[PDB]
Design a protein around this ligand. Structure first.
Ligand SMILES: [Zn+2]
Ligand SMILES: [Zn+2]
Ligand SMILES: [Zn+2]
Ligand SMILES: [Zn+2]
Length: 1188
RNA sequence: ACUUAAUGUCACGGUACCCAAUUUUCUGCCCC
RNA sequence: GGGGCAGAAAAUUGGGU
């Protein structure tokens, strides 16, 4: 009586090379994969997959013994004995397992039990010749066939419990159950006595080859070549540095649709640029990169958009990188015991962006681009493997039990501990989310503690899934009683009203990746002892648990005896305190720029730097929510606290964090342990209260010599908005384990307190004043153990030529301080704060002595004057959220320029390779901008910082805090503006008229009241000059007070005094901000309101001295009288304000032009005036020019 | 046949896990 | 008599089990 039996795997099963019983001993995989499916080749490719008949027989007899245990060793009223499992040749496989037994004449080969003949105890065939078997299990063949088509190699793992690191790993060949998941075989049964029991066992076999199963009776060559063409074309442009970034852009293009390249939506470049985008408008093969990508897309339509973009990015990455003992255990259950099997169906919603790691492609081949890829199956949809889910359940049960074991491999004895007993009764299925969308890329860097900049070779990208995917959850427990320890884990994982889910599933848990909120839980159970008849009929609802989750099988009454969350002893005692949540919102009153630069090149808008935004999946509405959520990354959130504790405790700056037990290694984990604190993303919850959530802020580095924009230094950032009147709320959180002593909890409380004080700004451009934290409010749900724990300068400058004129002076002069530059090779590290050095904050007022011009260049039509005069770049004053502000880059720019001039630093921003030979070829070699810290750093470069060394002085965005707001012109278009003159580029050829003239110094602008000429001649300037050359903008009035902070850290005793002197050089001396400096606009006076010092302790005026006084002493060796030093007397003459009488200051005109005798081509003629122009345009800060 | 051996397959018997701040520097500025 | 730059230099994987 032949029986045709067909397999059907409902989750990825595993297979191994068949080898042989003699040859299995040689290879570890074959012995490990004895119970898996088998693979034999038909070269080493295109084999055939099968599962051995012996394995199916072992599963069947295990089902038989289980069923007979259910029915006291008697199925269908036919009694069966206890069987035999002892041998005096041994079988090819030894049971090494506890055997289910029962209470139950002798058995011979005449009237053997159905169990006996199912085992084939007394058949003609023993240990192979012909089909003499009473029951025969033939090989089950799957029903060409390359292995990579059926299976993909996967590296599994064994994670330690006391630590969090892996202890060992092994590979696997999880097959494709979707397509190649059906195996057909023959079972021949000579004796009809055990046919019913055999069929019942077939229907009772639940899983084989590591997968739930049912038993029922009866291209690249062309794309890589074109990527090589693109790389060679970039070589022709010498732009090979951005082919690495271009690969990332192509990889992220898979997130966007085909329209981003078909109907070009990539940034098109500036309108007047004439070069287009710096990356997309690159001629490859003489053809633009956007058009080249479009041609490639229409030439590779067959493979699909996501595949094409992935392969193109991977290929660009490759070409860039290519060039860069024997015991029997009879277990008899007590008579009358009731055994059941519970089903735990539900959805594993991801409360955090998850990550399930997988080995890199070309290494996962059984038989690419991102550093860490996420695990997906063949259809590119996210997968939660049962092995990763079961491994987390084992850890969580061990936590719930409180006493488990480190699971041992190869043990001849089943582990008798609490957790291992229940893992054998627990079976749980593999799950894939029905969401076939590309995983988001989340980059990561490591900051160098010494320099507070990135570490060399420490940038990597991680494929992470969206937050909110709902994966199906199936958990079957077959036992006599449902354990309260497993119910606790189900309740621990369940997302209650305040539990919010605690299923830490997958990897990267320290950065809050993979905290799943298990939900939609329904409990179903089978009365397996007395309601087994239709458990075989329905196959235990195997493979159709989605129907159970949606909704009525017979014999599957719901389990209503499932305890609540606050009713289980192992939950509240062991699982509830396992991780303690600390939720808090960070209030930042400054623009926030997390600098998602890769996404900037792809999204429309054409911004050099944009803000990082997440991609949150919505379960209710399906798909991804159209509006992405802006957030400070959890890794950025994690690393800021890690840096915070390192500087407070001195753990940062260590030579190497080996197997270390310091405070930071203990709290945040290291090579040989796991972090006991894990952080989540800092989502912006204050996003809907902003009229324009992001803000376009333009920046440019001003040349020290010419006082104008550099050759290539103009860059625009696109951070979030935010101001003191309207800050950003960032409701992040972190989880605290139950192992922190009082010292460590207080050590983190201080770290968060330092965040509140503003020591660690969020995102990039912290020194510019981005991401400055204005305060932290702790959530109520935070445990009480944590929440409860939380100047006038009297210097006066004389002045020489202006007082004795009641003369026309040149609008700018040069500070020739010489080439003597002192470099601090002993760089001050941003590591643990030094006791002898000083840190704190400076509160400074900012009074405008002349009208101020800080344009909000986010709009070229802020005053709405482009319609009347096309091409007229009308500007509005800089403002965030509607209130006027001065960006800290503007404040840092003049102070650094003043500090560099005061301390005789180098020309940090200088236009080299500019013909006048080049400008850089005549600036000596000590005033040149500083390279890496090997050659030392200038006092300005040691304080404000340079490349690969963060500056120790942070300038904030100046608020306003009352004052006379606007200057009223009474005749301008908005009645609160001023049309400026033709602001032309600085001309170094005037200051360097010949090769004999080596170089003038830093260009500084006088403090004249020449803006009144512009104010008075408003009618004569809007008509005699073309609108596209002039600029109009609203200007501040006289005596406008601002307020900005200077978060200075790790400054020497004299460095702080130097900057205070740099901030407030004294009476009659001020600074210059914004446009109109040649026109007398923007003369600002800085007054230090209060200096605070932490080691929070305000220093008095008596202590303000001896900072400036020895800062004066430092200048000597390179009340104080600053005019004694020759280069500070010249410096303060330029910054001298001669109206605190009314000197006349203007540029000469070209010949008899529209004058107001002091004309170019006469004053610039060698015959009329010798080449002493530099002798009076430089090194003489107030030389008269009209009488000369 | 490729491929099982049979009175004994806890491999669902093992989380690809751990360490890392997309940041550092830059006045939206200006005359032959 | 004339608009000029509108990003540049870097790091874009290194260690464990
Ligand atoms: Zn028997
Ligand atoms: Zn154990
Ligand atoms: Zn350490
Ligand atoms: Zn320098």
């Amino acid at each position: 009586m032949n029986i045709t039996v067909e397999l059907t795997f409902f989750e990825p099963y595993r297979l191994v090379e068949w080898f042989d019983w003699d040859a299995r001993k040689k290879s570890h995989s074959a012995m490990r994969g004895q119970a898996f499916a088998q693979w034999t080749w038909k070269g080493r490719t295109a084999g055939k997959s099968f599962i051995t008949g012996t394995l199916v027989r072992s599963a069947v007899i295990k089902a038989v013994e289980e069923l007979l245990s259910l029915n006291n060793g008697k199925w269908e009223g036919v009694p069966c004995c206890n069987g035999s499992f002892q041998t005096d040749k041994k079988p090819s496989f030894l049971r090494k397992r506890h055997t289910l037994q029962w209470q139950a004449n002798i058995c011979d080969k005449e009237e053997a039990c159905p169990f006996c003949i199912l085992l084939g105890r007394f058949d003609n065939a023993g240990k192979e010749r012909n089909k003499d078997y009473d029951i025969h299990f033939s090989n089950f063949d799957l029903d060409d066939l390359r292995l990579v088509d059926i299976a993909s190699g996967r590296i599994l793992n064994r994670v330690d419990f006391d630590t969090g690191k892996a202890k060992d790993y092994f590979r696997t060949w999880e097959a494709d159950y979707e397509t190649y998941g059906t195996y057909t075989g023959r079972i021949t049964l000579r004796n009809e006595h055990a046919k019913k029991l055999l069929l019942a066992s077939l229907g009772f076999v639940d899983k084989l080859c590591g997968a739930l199963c049912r038993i029922e009776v009866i291209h690249n060559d062309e794309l890589r070549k074109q990527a090589e063409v693109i790389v060679e074309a970039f070589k022709q442009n010498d732009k090979l540095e951005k082919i690495r970034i271009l690969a990332d852009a192509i990889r992220t293009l898979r997130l966007h649709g085909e329209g981003v390249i078909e109907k070009d939506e990539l940034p098109d470049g500036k309108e007047e640029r004439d070069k287009g985008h710096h990356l997309w408008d690159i001629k490859v093969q003489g053809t633009a990169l956007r058009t080249k990508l479009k041609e490639l897309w229409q030439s590779n339509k067959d493979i699909g958009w996501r595949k094409f973009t992935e392969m193109l990015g991977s290929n660009l990455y490759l070409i860039y990188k290519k060039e860069t003992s024997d015991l029997f255990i009879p277990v008899t259950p007590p008579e009358g015991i009731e055994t059941k099997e519970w089903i735990i169906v539900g959805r594993l919603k991801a409360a955090t962006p998850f990550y399930f790691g997988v080995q890199q492609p070309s290494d996962s081949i059984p038989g690419e681009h991102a550093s860490f890829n996420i695990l997906l199956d063949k259809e590119n949809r996210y997968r939660i493997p049962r092995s990763a889910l079961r491994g987390a359940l084992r850890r969580d049960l061990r936590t719930a039990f409180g006493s488990g074991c480190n699971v041992s491999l190869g043990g001849q004895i089943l582990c008798n501990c609490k957790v291992c007993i229940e893992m054998r009764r627990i079976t749980l299925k593999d799950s894939v989310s029905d969401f076939s969308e590309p995983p988001e890329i989340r980059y990561r860097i490591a900051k160098n503690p010494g320099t507070a900049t990135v570490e060399d070779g420490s940038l990597f990208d991680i494929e992470v899934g969206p937050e909110g995917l709902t994966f199906p959850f199936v958990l079957r427990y077959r036992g006599h009683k449902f354990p309260e320890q497993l119910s606790s884990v189900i309740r621990y994982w369940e997302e209650n009203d305040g539990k919010n889910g605690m299923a830490w599933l997958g990897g990267l848990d320290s950065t809050g990746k993979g905290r799943f909120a298990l939900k939609d839980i329904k409990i179903f159970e089978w009365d397996l002892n007395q309601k087994i008849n239709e458990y075989i009929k329905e196959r235990g609802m195997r493979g159709k648990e989605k129907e159970l989750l949606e909704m009525l099988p017979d014999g599957l009454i719901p389990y209503k005896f499932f305890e609540e969350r606050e009713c289980l002893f192992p939950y509240k005692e062991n699982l509830k305190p396992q991780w303690s949540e600390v939720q808090y919102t960070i209030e930042v009153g400054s623009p926030l720029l997390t600098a998602d630069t890769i996404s900037a090149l792809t999204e429309p808008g054409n911004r050099a730097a944009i803000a990082y935004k997440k991609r949150v999946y919505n379960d209710g509405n399906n798909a991804i929510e159209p509006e992405p959520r802006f957030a400070v990354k959890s890794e950025t959130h994690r690393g800021i606290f890690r840096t915070a504790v390192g500087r407070r405790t001195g753990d940062l700056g260590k030579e190497d964090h080996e197997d270390c037990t310091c405070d930071m290694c203990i709290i945040f984990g290291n090579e040989h342990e796991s972090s006991k604190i894990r952080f989540e993303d800092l989502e912006l919850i204050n996003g809907n209260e902003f009229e324009k959530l992001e803000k376009h802020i333009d920046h440019v580095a001003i040349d020290r010599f010419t006082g104008g924009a550099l050759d290539k230094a103009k860059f625009d950032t696109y951070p979030l908005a935010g101001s003191p009147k309207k800050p950003l709320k960032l409701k992040g959180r972190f989880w605290i384990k139950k192992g922190f002593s009082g010292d460590h909890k207080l050590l983190i409380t201080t770290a968060l307190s330092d965040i509140r004080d503003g020591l660690y700004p969020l995102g990039s451009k912290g020194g510019v004043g981005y991401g400055w934290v204005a305060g932290i409010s702790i959530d109520d749900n935070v445990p009480d153990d944590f929440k409860e724990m939380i100047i006038n300068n009297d210097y006066v400058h004389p002045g020489h030529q202006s007082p004795k004129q009641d003369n026309i002076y040149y609008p700018h002069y040069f500070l020739d301080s010489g080439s003597k530059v002192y470099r601090e090779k002993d760089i001050i590290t941003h590591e643990e704060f030094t006791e002898e050095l000083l840190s704190g904050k400076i509160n400074c007022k900012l009074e405008t002595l002349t009208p101020l011009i800080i344009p909000d260049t986010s709009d070229e039509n802020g005053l709405k004057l482009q319609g009347n005069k096309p091409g007229h770049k009308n500007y509005k004053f800089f403002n965030i959220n509607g209130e006027l502000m001065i960006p800290g880059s503007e404040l840092r720019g003049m102070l650094r320029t003043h500090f560099e001039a005061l301390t005789k630093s180098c020309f940090a921003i200088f236009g080299e390779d500019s013909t006048l030979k080049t400008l850089g070829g005549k600036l000596d070699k000590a005033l040149h901008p500083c390279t890496g810290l090997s050659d030392g750093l200038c006092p300005g470069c040691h304080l404000f910082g340079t490349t690969d060394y963060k500056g120790r002085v942070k300038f904030g965005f100046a608020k306003y805090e009352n004052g006379p707001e606007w200057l009223i012109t009474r005749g301008n278009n908005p009645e609160r503006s001023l049309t400026l003159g033709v602001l032309e580029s600085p001309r170094p050829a005037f200051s360097i008229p010949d090769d004999e003239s080596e170089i003038p110094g830093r260009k500084f602008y006088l403090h004249h009241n020449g803006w009144r000429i512009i104010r008075q001649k408003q009618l004569e300037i809007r008509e005699t000059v073309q609108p596209e050359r002039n600029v109009t903008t609203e200007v501040m009035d006289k005596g406008n007070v601002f307020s900005f902070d200077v978060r200075f850290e790790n400054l020497r005793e004299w460095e702080l005094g130097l900057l205070l002197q740099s901030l407030d050089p004294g009476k009659n001396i001020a600074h210059k901000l914004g446009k109109g400096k040649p026109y007398g606009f923007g003369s600002v006076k800085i007054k230090i309101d209060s200096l605070h010092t932490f080691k929070i302790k305000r220093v008095p005026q008596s202590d303000i001295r001896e900072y400036i006084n020895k800062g004066y002493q430092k200048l000597i060796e390179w009340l104080p009288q600053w005019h004694v030093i020759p280069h500070i007397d010249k410096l303060y003459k330029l910054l001298w304000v001669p109206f605190l009488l009314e000197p006349d200051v203007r540029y000469p005109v070209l010949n008899e032009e529209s004058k107001g005798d002091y004309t170019y081509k006469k004053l610039g003629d060698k015959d009329n005036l010798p080449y002493k122009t530099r002798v009076k345009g430089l090194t003489t800060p107030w030389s008269p020019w009209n009488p000369f």
